[PDB]
DNA sequence: AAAAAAAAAAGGCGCCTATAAAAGGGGTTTCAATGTATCTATAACCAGGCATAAGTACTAAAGGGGGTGGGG
């Protein structure tokens, strides 16, 4: 019949099609990793007839700010169109160069929900006024979901803003991860966009991508490189520096 | 009994009241509205005392990752 997926924990279940990913063994199915589900572009540009019961989307509102980029900020925004994850992957640029932009521009293209992680809630907040642009953070088109407040929305710069996460009952997104598909979560969030990617490398905050459907991903950083060399898994998860000056 | 001083009283003198009508000047004495220093009720002033709200630093906590040294 026609093709068919479904999220179950941070996982893809897969129907009807061998091709698309991987088989399971122990059970007669297919099954992937929440953040491989991107293969479904495979039938998006094609316009593959599928059914999508795994992502659960927030609805969102196509978004048209207006945002100008200098020639710099368009060249890693249009490396990162590529794949949106292998292309997109993470941009690396010194602090002045305005990889918000880029990220605001990825929102904006991409207009879908989306998830930013950040270390910090300042960084949040400010994250969160930046996103204003697509309607006001006093607009319910911004959201932030940590412990504080959980607030689960659409698409912005990235509508919802959430913090890597932390050890405790209630945390960031890491610990979130199967409830909502963000950078960090599972099902709610088709961007991911992590704001100083090189965090994400943490045992724990991988999970965040892994355990995520969200087909597109964005890492910004002005270091990659970890003297763990612990980056390297940020190439499956997240991609790899499609872009660096 | 007498002389003496002190007292009340008389008679006389002068001026007052009410009557009258009608030509120019200067006097003192009392009373009018319009103002200083001091008073009143008001309005407004400081400094000092107590209660509520905003900001502080403080201690306070738990959660973890990474690197170096020692032992097998």
New binding site residues.
Partial sequence: SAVIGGDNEREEEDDDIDAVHSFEIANESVEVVKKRCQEIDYPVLEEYDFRNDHRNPDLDIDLKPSTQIRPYQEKSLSKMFGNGRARSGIIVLPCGAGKTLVGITAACTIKKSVIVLCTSSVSVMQWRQQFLQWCTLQPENCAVFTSDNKEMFQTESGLVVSTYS???NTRNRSHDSQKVMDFLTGREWGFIILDEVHVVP???FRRVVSTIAAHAKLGLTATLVR??D?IGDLNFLIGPKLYEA
Wanted: no cysteine; proline share 0%.
């Fill in positions: 932390m050890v405790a943490a045992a724990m003297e763990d612990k």
